Amino acid sequence: HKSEIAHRFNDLGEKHFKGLVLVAFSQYLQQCPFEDHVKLVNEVTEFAKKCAADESAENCDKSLHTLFGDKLCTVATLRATYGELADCCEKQEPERNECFLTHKDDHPNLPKLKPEPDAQCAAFQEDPDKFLGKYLYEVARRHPYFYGPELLFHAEEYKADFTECCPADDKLACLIPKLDALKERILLSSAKERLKCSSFQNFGERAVKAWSVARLSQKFPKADFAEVSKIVTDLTKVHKECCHGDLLECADDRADLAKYICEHQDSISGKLKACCDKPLLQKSHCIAEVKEDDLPSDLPALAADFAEDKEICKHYKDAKDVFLGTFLYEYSRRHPDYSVSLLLRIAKTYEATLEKCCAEADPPACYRTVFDQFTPLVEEPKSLVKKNCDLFEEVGEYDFQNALIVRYTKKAPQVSTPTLVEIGRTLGKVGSRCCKLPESERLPCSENHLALALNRLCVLHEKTPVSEKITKCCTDSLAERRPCFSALELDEGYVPKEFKAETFTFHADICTLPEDEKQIKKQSALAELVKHKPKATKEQLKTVLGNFSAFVAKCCGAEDKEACFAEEGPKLVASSQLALA
Ligand SMILES: C[C@H](C(=O)O)c1cccc(C(=O)c2ccccc2)c1
Ligand SMILES: C[C@H](C(=O)O)c1cccc(C(=O)c2ccccc2)c1
Ligand SMILES: C[C@H](C(=O)O)c1cccc(C(=O)c2ccccc2)c1
Ligand SMILES: CCCCCCCCC(=O)O
Numbered sequence: 031h032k033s034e035i036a037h038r039f040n041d042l043g044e045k046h047f048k049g050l051v052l053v054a055f056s057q058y059l060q061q062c063p064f065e066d067h068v069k070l071v072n073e074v075t076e077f078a079k080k081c082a083a084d085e086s087a088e089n090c091d092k093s094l095h096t097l098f099g100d101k102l103c104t105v106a107t108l109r110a111t112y113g114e115l116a117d118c119c120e121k122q123e124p125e126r127n128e129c130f131l132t133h134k135d136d137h138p139n140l141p142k143l144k145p146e147p148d149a150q151c152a153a154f155q156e157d158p159d160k161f162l163g164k165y166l167y168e169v170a171r172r173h174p175y176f177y178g179p180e181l182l183f184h185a186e187e188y189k190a191d192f193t194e195c196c197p198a199d200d201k202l203a204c205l206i207p208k209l210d211a212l213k214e215r216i217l218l219s220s221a222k223e224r225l226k227c228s229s230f231q232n233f234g235e236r237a238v239k240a241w242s243v244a245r246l247s248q249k250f251p252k253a254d255f256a257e258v259s260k261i262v263t264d265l266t267k268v269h270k271e272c273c274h275g276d277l278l279e280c281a282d283d284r285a286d287l288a289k290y291i292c293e294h295q296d297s298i299s300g301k302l303k304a305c306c307d308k309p310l311l312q313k314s315h316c317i318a319e320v321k322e323d324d325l326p327s328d329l330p331a332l333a334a335d336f337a338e339d340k341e342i343c344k345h346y347k348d349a350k351d352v353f354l355g356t357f358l359y360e361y362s363r364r365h366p367d368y369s370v371s372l373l374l375r376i377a378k379t380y381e382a383t384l385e386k387c388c389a390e391a392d393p394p395a396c397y398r399t400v401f402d403q404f405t406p407l408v409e410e411p412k413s414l415v416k417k418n419c420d421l422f423e424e425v426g427e428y429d430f431q432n433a434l435i436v437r438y439t440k441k442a443p444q445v446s447t448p449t450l451v452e453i454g455r456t457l458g459k460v461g462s463r464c465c466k467l468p469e470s471e472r473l474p475c476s477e478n479h480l481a482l483a484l485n486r487l488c489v490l491h492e493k494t495p496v497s498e499k500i501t502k503c504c505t506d507s508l509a510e511r512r513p514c515f516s517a518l519e520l521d522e523g524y525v526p527k528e529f530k531a532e533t534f535t536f537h538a539d540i541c542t543l544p545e546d547e548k549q550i551k552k553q554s555a556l557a558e559l560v561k562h563k564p565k566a567t568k569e570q571l572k573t574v575l576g577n578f579s580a581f582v583a584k585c586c587g588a589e590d591k592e593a594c595f596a597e598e599g600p601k602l603v604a605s606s607q608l609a610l611a
Pocket of ligand 3 (some may be wrong): 436572
């Protein structure tokens with residue numbers, strides 16, 4: 031391949047090429063308007079077309095990193111708007127691309143995307159290509175680590191909605207509950223992918239491989255070790271490329287893997303039939319979200335190879351990577367009822383037991399009971415899910431969220447109120463999605479979603495560290511994160527936050543808000559109560575938050591709303607300090 035840009039343009043096609051180039055530049059240049067990005071994509075596409083025609087032509091032989099970085103570094107007002115990226119532009123490759131990746135702005139703090147059914151249908155009918163382009167741009171610049179090919183698929187779902195609802199007489203009623211649905215899927219898809227890039231960033235490639243082996247083995251328990259290894263190998267390279275901004279290489283390798291899985295469908299899973307008779311982007315997405323295959327009847331007993339065999343210490347010392355790899359593969363297949371992080375905890379415990387037993391006088395008598403060391407690792411998560419799902423089913427999403435906000439504020443009262451509310455709210459919505467499932471599917475649903483919310487929190491903590499306890503849980507071990515976070519207790523060294531009257535002061539503006547923005551104001555007050563009175567019992571806090579809810583409802587239903595807030599507000603504040611003693 032003489033011209034790498036021609037190669038990728040030839041393989042991907044103009045439509046997807048333009049999309050992936052837009053995403054690539056949007057994820058870095060988050061402040062630059064859409065119009066300006068379009069002009070940048072047009073110039074890049076023109077260069078690809080020229081190179082596709084004559085591969086010996088000017089600068090066509092240069093690397094994709096060279097061409098990308100050179101182009102990024104020609105953008106108007108770079109030093110002023112993107113001072114960090116501007117410093118990278120001094121450097122040669124591969125140092126320059128490495129600098130770009132380091133200084134990629136994680137949370138840009140742009141306004142929330144509000145659907146405009148009338149204006150967006152108009153823009154869509156006017157020019158749909160540009161309308162889809164704008165969607166890629168808006169999502170890419172808000173989620174800088176979003177997988178290029180996956181975002182193209184979400185753009186198709188976005189398109190499908192707007193083709194279906196714009197013809198309809200009523201638009202708002204048609205689009206909002208679909209665009210609300212699409213926004214959740216974007217948040218989850220973005221979160222899953224941020225965990226993969228975070229895992230690479232924080233724990234390296236060996237951790238991503240072990241996670242993938244565990245997950246694919248659960249999804250494809252029919253597949254043999256050599257098949258899982260092949261998929262994990264190819265998928266890791268895909269994940270590495272997409273996470274490191276190599277969208278063109280990534281889109282191509284992802285398409286190839288999807289083509290391989292579907293060609294070898296019969297020996298991988300019987301659930302891939304639906305996925306494999308679909309178009310390109312829909313196929314890849316379907317495989318990624320595919321239901322776990324039925325357990326094979328012929329899954330082998332593991333006690334013989336991993337507990338009873340007299341030469342395991344020999345197998346461990348000599349054939350280590352294969353032996354531990356085979357264990358993780360085999361143990362994962364037979365436990366779709368376990369979370370990925372639980373399976374990696376069990377693997378780490380298997381290894382640790384072999385280290386100990388194989389250093390001592392009679393190893394076989396020692397490691398014979400290795401499987402029984404897993405029992406505690408399975409019960410701790412199973413109990414917390416049973417316990418939290420009982421609470422959720424009793425009190426509902428709102429009070430469950432409030433329960434979690436109190437729990438975490440007490441664990442980490444140094445963390446900002448918005449973050450505490452966001453995390454407690456998110457893990458509340460986990461209760462809503464997961465607790466209503468069959469009891470066996472709860473733990474994986476819960477602890478896998480917990481991994482997404484904890485990764486979120488750990489990314490915010492990189493931006494603004496507040497707690498050494500949090501830094502340790504976030505950086506020490508991927509497998510041990512949730513346990514480490516669960517282990518945290520109320521820091522007895524913490525100084526109760528100085529009481530600001532203004533903090534618990536409410537006005538009539540609260541009454542016009544939708545129900546969830548109302549909740550957030552009160553949930554923000556709950557966090558502030560725990561911050562001022564952290565030794566207050568969970569029951570004391572439930573009482574006071576009740577008084578705040580009663581007060582808001584009373585004054586929002588008043589003749590003079592502002593006179594009610596102004597009169598009753600200070601009284602509620604004063605009595606609450608005494609109630610939380
Ligand atoms: C509007 C402009 C164009 O089309 O010149 C443009 C610039 C960049 C990306 C894209 C796209 O993603 C896209 C989406 C659907 C069809 C074709 C392109 C489109
Ligand atoms: C690095 C990244 C990728 O490898 O996916 C990427 C994204 C978009 C475009 C290009 C280019 O090769 C390019 C070509 C000409 C001008 C500007 C960029 C490269
Ligand atoms: C209802 C139940 C109880 O009190 O035994 C319970 C269990 C767990 C946590 C909490 C809370 O902290 C809480 C605080 C305010 C509102 C809602 C829940 C309450
Ligand atoms: C700083 C926020 C702490 C969040 C801990 C979440 C762990 C899950 C739990 O045990 O509830």
